Design a protein around this ligand. Structure first.
Ligand SMILES: NC(=O)c1ccc[n+]([C@@H]2O[C@H](COP(=O)([O-])OP(=O)(O)OC[C@H]3O[C@@H](n4cnc5c(N)ncnc54)[C@H](O)[C@@H]3O)[C@@H](O)[C@H]2O)c1
Ligand SMILES: NC(=O)c1ccc[n+]([C@@H]2O[C@H](COP(=O)([O-])OP(=O)(O)OC[C@H]3O[C@@H](n4cnc5c(N)ncnc54)[C@H](O)[C@@H]3O)[C@@H](O)[C@H]2O)c1
Ligand SMILES: NC(=O)c1ccc[n+]([C@@H]2O[C@H](COP(=O)([O-])OP(=O)(O)OC[C@H]3O[C@@H](n4cnc5c(N)ncnc54)[C@H](O)[C@@H]3O)[C@@H](O)[C@H]2O)c1
Ligand SMILES: NC(=O)c1ccc[n+]([C@@H]2O[C@H](COP(=O)([O-])OP(=O)(O)OC[C@H]3O[C@@H](n4cnc5c(N)ncnc54)[C@H](O)[C@@H]3O)[C@@H](O)[C@H]2O)c1
Lengths: 337, 337, 337, 337
C-alpha cells in the first residue's frame, strides 16, 4: 500500500528486497529500483548471491526496463542524480536510500526535489537527521520527518543491549570494538581511498578504521551522551560481525546476572530484536539471523565487580535489512508516508 | 635520460616504479605521476604494500605536489582527463598508461594531444596498436610507433614458451586455461559489473571469465594465427597466476624432451624471460620473480605422443612490470622517444 | 531396512548422513557412527556446518553413547582400529568407509573381520577393489563384491560426460586439470606432509597435486584405458570444484553440437547425474547441487574441429555424497548386503 | 657454544631457526632437530615458507639424517617419544620444546630423562614451571630452573606495555581481547577438536576461543594478580595479531599522555621489546617485526578520564621467536645450561 522506491540496489538494497519478500501481509509495495548498473545485473544479482545463496523465487528480466519476482514486475531506472528521478511522476511515497553517497540533508533531500514524499537512509545520517533503532527509540518517530536514518549496523547491534545494561546497572563510561566483516567500501587490493587503512587489501589484513556507532548510540539513548567511544577492526570474512563492549557500571554484578538480564528483555520488550545464545558457535552460524543482536552468553565477563564485558553477534547485512523493513513498516503505519 | 610519466599509480603503476627503482643505470627518468587520488596516497601506498611488503627506501610527501623516493622528487598531478595533462609543458617523452581505461587509440591518443611524444599501454591495445612481448617480438619495434602495447600478463607468460614449442615441435592447434589471481577489476562483494561473473565476490569464488591472451599470442607469433584460444579462471589468491596449455604438435615427443627444449632456451635466447623450475613449489614461492614465465617441469605431460600439456607460473604484477620497464628501456634505446 | 554403519564422521560422513536424511523412503537404516572424536562433537558438527549451514532438524546428544536426529537415535562408538568394532554384534550390513585411511583391501577388510557383511569406500580403492560411478557403470555391480569403491569426486564429475563424448565423438586421447577446493588433507599453515605441495598453507596458495581421477576414469569406462591423464590445482575455496577437460576426438564437431549432445543425455540416461547450465554463474552458485557434474555450456570450445574443451562444475562434498547414498541404495536393492 | 636441540620443527621451530640464523655472534649452537616428519620436509619447509618467503640461504638435504644451512650441518632425528631422544649421547644442553604437546612437567621432563640438561617451552607451561617474558621479568631467571616457559605470544605482547601502564597509572582492573591470526591448532574445515569452536573452518569464521594470556600476565607481573582476564577472536589471517586492552587506572590521564609514556619506555628500558607506531598501517605491515609489541598510537582512547584503551600489534610467529632466541641467549649467559 505504501509506494516504495529502492535507490542503490547493492548489498543492502538487495537484502532489503529479499527480507521484504519473505514478510507476510507487508504494508509496503516496492515499485521501483534505481541503480547505475542495468536491468540484467539487477535481475542476475538478485537471483544469485555469494552470501545468501540462490533466491528461491522466479526472477527474470522484463523487457528493458523492469524485472519480475514471482510475477510481480518492478520498474528499473538508472539515474546517477537523484533529482532526475521520476519519484513525483510515479507517486513514490518512500525512498530507501542505500547508495551510501546521499547521507546528508542536501544529498538525500534531492529525492524530495524529484517528488518523493519521504526518505529513509540505510545508514547514519550526517547533520540534523532523526535516527532510529527499532526496539530502542522507534516510538519517537513522527510522520513529520521527511528524512530519517536507520543508523549503522553496529549501532543496531549495540544499542539494544546497551539499553538493558544502562536500565539495570547504570553505565558510567564505556568503550567498544567491532571485529567487522569487510564491505564494499574497502578495496579488494591496495588502491586509493580517503581512509589510508581501508585502502589496503581487505581479505589480507586486519584493518583498523573509525566508527561513529558508539557516539551514535547516544542519539538513540540520550542518557549515554559522551559516555561511549570505540573503533572497528575489519577482518577477512564476507558477512557477519561481532561487537565487544566494555563498560564500568554503577551496580556491582557478575556475568550470569548480566546474562539473565539480557534473557529477560529478549523474552519481552526486545523479543525479535535481541537474542541470547548459549551454544559455542562461530560467526557463520549467525548468518541470516533476523534479530539485530545476539549475546554470546558464555563470553560474558565481569572484572572488579563493575567492569562488564559483553560479546554480541550480528548479521550486518540481513539483520540490519530486517530492521530497515521494520522501520519502513512503521513509516507505513504512521500514515501514507 | 628519457622523461617518463606514469598515468595511473595503481598495482601496475606502483610495481613499475619499484621495478625501475631496483634497476642499475636505467635510461629512464620518472618525473611525473598522475593518478586521481592524492599525494598522501601515492606516497603511502608506494611505501606500504600488502603484496610486496614495505618499500625499502625513504618515501615521503614533498609539499602538496610531489613525493620523494630516496631524495629523488617526483611531481604528482591529478587529472582524470589525459588531454588536460601537462605532458607537453614538462616535455614528457614517454607516458606509461596503466589506468586500464585508455587502451584504444582515441583514449591513449589523448596523452599525445596533451604533449607527450609516445605512449606505452600496460595492457592489450584495442584496435590497431602494435603489441610487443619482450623476448618474442620486441625486435620488430620501431621508434615511429606513437602508441604501443605490452600485452597482458598472461600473454607474456604464454608467448615465450609457446614460441619454443612451435619452433621445435610445430603447433597444430591448442587451448589454454589460466588459474588467475583476482585483480582490481573484480568486485570484493557481489556488485554491478558488465561481466556478470566478475561481478561476484572475488575471494569467495572460482570465477570463469574471458581472456584474449590466447588470440593475442598470434599478434606476437603470427605463425599461430587462429590456432589458439582459452579462458581464465579467477581464484582467491591476491597475486601470482598459472597457465595450463594443451597443444597438439606435429613432431611426436615426450615430457622430458619438451622440458629439455625449454631449458635450452631458458639458458640462451630466453634467458631472463623464461625459467624452468624442478622443485615442487606452490604459487607463493613464485612471488617477486623477474622472469615472465616459469615452467613447472614435473607437471609437464604428453598424451598420445603429440598432445603436450605445460604448466607455467607467473607473477602477474611484478614479472609483468619488469617487462614494462624492459620495453621502456627499448624505447629509450631507439632514440629519444 | 539395510543396517548401515558410518566409519569416519568427517566431511563425507556428515554430508552422507544429511543427504540420506533428505531422501524419501530410503532402503537404508543408519544405526551406528564410529569416529575417534566424541558424541558431543558428532552432535555439534552435524548440527552446525560452515558449508551447509545449520542442519534443519532436531539434533542432540543422547546419553554418552548416542545422538538423535529428529527422534531417531544413532549409536556412537569410538574405535581407531576397525577390527575392534561391534559390527558383527550389531549385525551391520554395510559399512560406509569414509576415514580416508582404509582404502586398500587389508585395511577395509578389517570391517569384515569385525563382522560387517560389506564395505563401501567413499574414495578410490587401492589394489583390486571394484569401483563404480553411478550413471556410468553401476549396472556391473554384483552382491558378491564384499568391498567396493565409489571412486573420487573428480572421477564422478568427469566420467559422466566423458562417456557421452566417447559415445558420440570417439575420444582418441585427452588430458584434464581440476581447479579444486581445498580439503582436510591439506595443511592450514605450512606443515609436514608426504606431499611437499599439499604441505603448504592451503588458503594462501594455488597448490598443484596429483590425481588418479583421469586414469580412474578408465576403470569405469574401459574403452578409455591409457587415453587420459591429468592433475589437480588446489585453490582457496572451501567447497565446489571445476574440471577442465581437453580431448582430441575422431568426429569433427563444434561447441554447440557438443553442448547439444550433453543436453540429450542430461534429459535421458544421465538425468539426475549430469546437468547443463547456460547461465553465467560462479562456483558458489553450484553449492548443494545433487548432480555430480554440470557443464558450463558457454565455456565449451572446439579448436581445429577435433580438439574439444569442456568445463564442468561439481560440489565435491554434497554431490559426491548423493552418489554414495545412491550406490548404497543399489547395494540395498541387490539383496541384504 | 650452547648445544641446542629443537623439538618440533613447526611454525615456531622453523621461525626460531631463522631468527637465530640472522643473529650475530650467537652464544647458541643448534645441532639437532627432532620432528616426526622426515629430512626432506625439514629441508624443504625451512627453505620455502608461505609467510616468510624463500629463506635467503643455501638449504639442502645432507644424506638421510641431516640438513645443512649455508654449510652448517644439523642432525635430524625422528622420535615421537622424547624419552628415546639421543639428548644425553649428543650432550644436548638446551632443548627448545615447540611441539605443543609437552607443556607440563612430566611431558617436558622427558627430555631430561633422555639426557638434556634443560628445557625451554615455547608456550605457557602447565603447572609449576617458571615463565618469563623478556623485558618484563627475565632478570628473575636462575640457572637452577630445569624447565622454563617463554609464555604465549599474546602474553609477550601484552605484558610489556601492561607493565608501563601499571607503573605510571596504576591498574585497578582490566580486560582484553585479541583478534588473532589462525594457527595450526585450528581446523582447515569443520573437523573434530576438543574446542567446539576451534573445530570450525578457520578461514571462514571469526572464532571465539579461550586464552590464559591475561591471567598469565600476572605470572610475570605479580602486582596484577586477579586483575585481568580476556578472550581470543581467531580470524582468517595467516600471521600477525592484535591485542585490545581496556583498563581502569588510578591516575586520571588522557590518550596522548598514555602514548607518551609508551614512547618513554620504548626509547629506554623496553627498547627492542616495545615500539610505538604513528602511521596508519594494517596487519600485514607488521609482518616480520622483531619487537614483541607495537602500540598503534592513533587508536589509543581514554574514557571518563580513567578507562584506558590500547591497541597493539604483534607478529605472533616471528616476534615471539625472536623472544625465544633472546631467552635462550640468557640461558646461555647464565652458565652452560
Ligand atoms: N554492507 C553492510 O553490512 C551495511 C550495513 C549497514 C548499513 N550499510 C550502509 O548502506 C549503504 C550501502 O552499503 P552497501 O554495502 O550495500 O554498498 P554497495 O556498494 O553494495 O551498494 C551501493 C549501491 O548503490 C549504487 N550506487 C552508487 N552510487 C549511486 C548513485 N549516484 N545513484 C544510484 N545508485 C548508486 C551502486 O552501484 C551499488 O549497487 C552505505 O551507506 C553503508 O554504510 C551497509
Ligand atoms: N594486476 C595485474 O596483474 C595486471 C597485469 C597486467 C596488465 N594489467 C593491466 O594494467 C591496467 C591497470 O591494472 P591495475 O591492476 O594496476 O589496476 P588498478 O586499479 O590498481 O590501477 C588503476 C589506477 O589508475 C587510476 N585511474 C583510474 N582511472 C583514471 C583516470 N581517468 N585518470 C587517472 N588515473 C586513473 C586508479 O585510481 C588506479 O590507481 C589494466 O589495463 C590491466 O588490465 C594488470
Ligand atoms: N572432501 C571431499 O570433497 C571428498 C570428496 C570425495 C571423496 N573424499 C574422500 O573421503 C575420505 C574422507 O575425506 P573427508 O574430507 O571427509 O575427510 P575428513 O578429515 O573430514 O574426515 C575423516 C574423518 O575420519 C575420522 N578418522 C580418521 N582416522 C580414523 C580412524 N582410524 N578411525 C575412525 N575414524 C577415523 C576423522 O576424525 C574424521 O572425522 C577420504 O578418503 C577422501 O579422499 C573426500
Ligand atoms: N603459531 C604461533 O603463533 C605460536 C606463537 C607462540 C607460541 N606457540 C606455541 O608453540 C607450539 C607449537 O606451535 P606451532 O604453531 O609451531 O605448531 P606446529 O603444528 O606448526 O608445530 C608443531 C610441530 O611439532 C611436531 N610434533 C607434534 N608432535 C610431536 C611429537 N610427539 N614429537 C616430535 N614432533 C612432534 C609437528 O609435526 C610440527 O612440526 C604450541 O605449544 C603453541 O602454543 C605458537
Amino acid at each position: 500500500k505504501l509506494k516504495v522506491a529502492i535507490n542503490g540496489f547493492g548489498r543492502i538494497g538487495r537484502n532489503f528486497l529479499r527480507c521484504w519478500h519473505g514478510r507476510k501481509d507487508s504494508p509496503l509495495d516496492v515499485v521501483v529500483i534505481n541503480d547505475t548498473g542495468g536491468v540484467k545485473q539487477a535481475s542476475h544479482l538478485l537471483k544469485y548471491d555469494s552470501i545468501l545463496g540462490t533466491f528461491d523465487a522466479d526472477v527474470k528480466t522484463a523487457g528493458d526496463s523492469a524485472i519480475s519476482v514471482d510475477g510481480k514486475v518492478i520498474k528499473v531506472v538508472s539515474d546517477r542524480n537523484p533529482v532526475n528521478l521520476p519519484w513525483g511522476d510515479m507517486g513514490i511515497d518512500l525512498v530507501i536510500e542505500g547508495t551510501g553517497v546521499f547521507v546528508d540533508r542536501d544529498g538525500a533531500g534531492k529525492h524530495l526535489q524529484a517528488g518523493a514524499k519521504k526518505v529513509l537512509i540505510t545508514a547514519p545520517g550526517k547533520g540534523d537527521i532523526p535516527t532510529y533503532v527499532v526496539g530502542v527509540n522507534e516510538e519517537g518517530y513522527t510522520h513529520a520527518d521527511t528524512i530519517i536514518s536507520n543508523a549503522s549496523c553496529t549501532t543496531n547491534c549495540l544499542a539494544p543491549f546497551v539499553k538493558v545494561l544502562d536500565q539495570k546497572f547504570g553505565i558510567i563510561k564505556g568503550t567498544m570494538t567491532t571485529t567487522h566483516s569487510y564491505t564494499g567500501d574497502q578495496r579488494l587490493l591496495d588502491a586509493s581511498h580517503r581512509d589510508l587503512r581501508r585502502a589496503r587489501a581487505a581479505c589480507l589484513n586486519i584493518v583498523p578504521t573509525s566508527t561513529g556507532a558508539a557516539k551514535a548510540v547516544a542519539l538513540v539513548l540520550p542518557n549515554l551522551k559522551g559516555k561511549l567511544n570505540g573503533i572497528a577492526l575489519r577482518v577477512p570474512t564476507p558477512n557477519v560481525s561481532v561487537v565487544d563492549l566494555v563498560v564500568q557500571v554503577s551496580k556491582k554484578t557478575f556475568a550470569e546476572e548480566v546474562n539473565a538480564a539480557f534473557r529477560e528483555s529478549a523474552d519481552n520488550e526486545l523479543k525479535g530484536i535481541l537474542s541470547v545464545c548459549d551454544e559455542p558457535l562461530v560467526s557463520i552460524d549467525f548468518r541470516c539471523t533476523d534479530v539485530s543482536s545476539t549475546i554470546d552468553s558464555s563470553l560474558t565477563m565481569v572484572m572488579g565487580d563493575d567492569m562488564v564485558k559483553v560479546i554480541a553477534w550480528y548479521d550486518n547485512e540481513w539483520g540490519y535489512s530486517q530492521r530497515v523493513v521494520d522501520l519502513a513498516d512503521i513509516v507505513a503505519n504512521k500514515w501514507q508516508a
